[PDB]
């Protein structure tokens, strides 16, 4: 009644990446980088950079 | 008309809805890998010198 893993923003692979990565600058950079959506605007903004 | 800069700061953002950006900042935002792409034709056709 509290947490539907399918219908959720932060699914289980991001939890695995959180639990497995070493705490570093580059891991913070990665976890910001994986918050990008699969939207066509995200594809456009990723093509431009 | 008057030498009061404070109201000049106030009377511009007075719940300002439309925020139009200039072409120059939109030029220098994007890098060179997409500036020559034909999607950026309007920014390219006024960069002639």
């Amino acid at each position: 009644q509290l947490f539907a893993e399918y219908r959720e923003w932060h699914r289980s692979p991001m939890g695995k990446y959180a639990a497995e990565c070493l705490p570093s600058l580059v891991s913070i950079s990665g976890m910001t980088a994986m918050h990008i959506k699969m939207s066509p605007m995200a594809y456009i903004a990723q093509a431009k950079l | 008309n008057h030498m009061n800069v404070l109201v000049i700061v106030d009377e511009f953002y007075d719940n300002k809805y439309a925020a139009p950006v200039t072409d120059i900042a939109l030029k220098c935002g994007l890098p060179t890998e997409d500036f020559l792409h034909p999607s950026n034709y309007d920014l390219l056709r006024l960069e002639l010198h």
Partner: peptide, 20 residues
């Protein structure tokens, strides 16, 4: 319609055409 138009504007709206 506006997001569809922005998408169609920021991409392209023998040559050997290639799929992906």
């Amino acid at each position: 319609q506006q997001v569809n138009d922005y998408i169609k504007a920021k991409v392209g709206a023998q040559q050997a055409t290639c799929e992906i």
